[PDB]
A paper describes a structure:
Mucin glycoproteins are the main structural component of mucus and thus play a central role in protecting exposed epithelia from pathogens and mechanical damage. The mucin protomer contains amino- and carboxy-terminal oligomerizing regions separated by a central serine- and threonine-rich segment heavily modified by O-linked glycans. In the first step of quaternary structure assembly, mucins dimerize by covalent association of their carboxy-terminal regions. The second major event in mucin multimerization occurs by covalent association of the amino-terminal regions.
To explore the mechanism of disulfide-linked multimerization of the [name] amino-terminal region, we determined the crystal structure of a recombinant [name] fragment containing the VWD3 domain and investigated the oligomerization state of the entire amino-terminal segment spanning almost 1400 amino acids. MUC2D3 containing high-mannose sugars was purified and treated with endoH to leave only a monosaccharide at glycosylated asparagines. Diffraction data were collected to 2.7 Å resolution. However, the MUC2D3 protomers in the crystal asymmetric unit were found to form two disulfide-linked dimers rather than a trimer, consistent with the sodium dodecyl sulfate polyacrylamide gel electrophoresis (SDS-PAGE) and SEC-MALS analyses of the [name] fragments. The structure of the MUC2D3 protomer shares the constituent folds and overall organization of the homologous regions of VWF, with the exception that E-3 is not packed as tightly against the VWD3 β-sandwich as in VWF. Cys1130, located in the TIL-3 domain, was suggested to be involved in [name] oligomerization, and its participation was confirmed by the MUC2D3 structure, in which Cys1130 bonds with its symmetry-mate across the dimer interface. Although a second cysteine is not necessary for dimerization, Cys1088, located at the amino terminus of a helix in the C8–3 domain, was found to form an additional intersubunit disulfide. These two disulfides are about 27 Å apart from one another in the interface. In addition to the areas around the two intermolecular disulfides, a third point of contact between the subunits in the dimer is observed midway between the disulfides, where a proline side chain (P1114) inserts into a hydrophobic pocket lined on three sides by aromatic side chains (F1120, Y1123, Y1124) and on the fourth by an intrasubunit disulfide (C1121–C1163). The small and predominantly polar multimerization interface observed in MUC2D3 may explain why it does not form readily in the early stages of protein assembly and why it may require a particular pH range, ion concentration, or other factors found further along the secretory pathway.
Author numbering: 856 to 942, 946 to 1226, 1237 to 1240
The structure:
Amino acid sequence: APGTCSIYGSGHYITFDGKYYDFDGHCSYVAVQDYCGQNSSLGSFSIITENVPCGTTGVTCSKAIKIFMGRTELKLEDKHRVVIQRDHVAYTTREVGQYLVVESSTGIIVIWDKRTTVFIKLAPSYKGTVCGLCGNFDHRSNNDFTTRDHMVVSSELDFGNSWKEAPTCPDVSTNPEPCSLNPHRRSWAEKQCSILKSSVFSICHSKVDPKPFYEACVHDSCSCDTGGDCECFCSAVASYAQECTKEGACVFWRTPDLCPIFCDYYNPPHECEWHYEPCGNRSFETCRTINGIHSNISVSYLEGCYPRCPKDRPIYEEDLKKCVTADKCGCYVEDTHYPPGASVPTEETCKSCVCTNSSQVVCRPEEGFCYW
Ligand SMILES: *[C@@H]1O[C@H](CO)[C@@H](O)[C@H](O)[C@H]1NC(C)=O
Ligand SMILES: [Ca+2]
C-alpha cells in the first residue's frame, strides 16, 4: 500500500490520492516534502521539479528533479543523476528499463524517464505528513489543494503558485488551451490519442479510467508544436500504460509503426541479450538490486529494454554493462561502483583499502607513525 505521485508531459499531475489536474508554471516547485507543519525547520526531504515552457501555447514541462534528503541534494538533469552536495542518508541509483531510479533507505523512490515524466513513491509511513503539488497522501482527494499556507482552495493556479521554490518566479494567471490555439493539430492529436480508448487498452479500462490521460495526450499533441510531437504522444500513452501495469493490466501497446523501441540496438555482434519487456520482469537481478537498497516498494514493473543473462552469469552488472557471477559484481560505497581489484578511497588516516576479487571491501594499515 504505497502512494504514487505522477508528473508528466506538458503540465499534468496526479496526486498520491487520485486527483488529476493540470498546472503550467515556469518555475521550480515542490512536488512533495514533509516540511509541512508550522516549523520552517521540521522535516526530512523535499522533491522539487524544475519546469520550463515547452511549445508556443504557454504550457510547461518538467525538465529536472531536485532531491533533498536531509542535508543532501541530488539533481536529475541532462539524463544523469548528479550529486550537488553530500555529507549521511543512504540512496542507490539504478537504471531500470526506460527509466532512472533513485531509491533511499528512508522509504522514497523517484522514477524519472529522463524527459518530462517522474513518478514519486512514498512508503505508507508518510501518510498525512507530506504536502506540495502531490498532495498530502491521506487517501482523500477533496483536500490535496492545500496552499503552502494551509488554506484549502479550488483554484488549480493558486495552489500551484504557492508551491514555487524561488520567489522571483512570476505567477501563472491562465491555463493554456493548446488545441483551440492550434486547431490545425486537432485532427492528428485526436487520431493518435484514440488508442487510449481503443481495444488495445481494453483490459485496463476496468482498472484505470482513460479520460484524463486521453485528454492530456491530446493537450500535448496540440501543444507540442515546436518539434518532436511524437515524443509527446508516446510519452503520453506510456504514462497510461504505467498506471495499468501498476493496477494489474499490463498492455503491449507498442508496435513498429506506433512508438517503436529499439532494444536490439544494445545487442553485441552474435548475441540476442536485449529485449523489450512491456511489464518488466519481477525477478530481474542486477548487481545493484542485490547489494544496494532493498525496500518493500517495487519498481520491477517498468517498461524498457532489459538484458537476459545466462545461467553461468545470471547477474547484470549495470556500470560495466556485462553479465557476471554474483561475487564478481564489485563494491558499492556511496553509490559508486568499484570493480574487483580496484582500490577504494578513504578519508581515513594510515588506512588503505581495496575491493577484493570477491566483491568485499577490506582495509589494511600502513606503518610508515601508525600501527594496527
Ligand atoms: C522549531 O521552531 C522553534 C521556534 O518555534 C525553534 O526553536 C526550533 O529550533 C525549530 N526547530 C526544531 C525544534 O527542530
Ligand atoms: Ca489528500
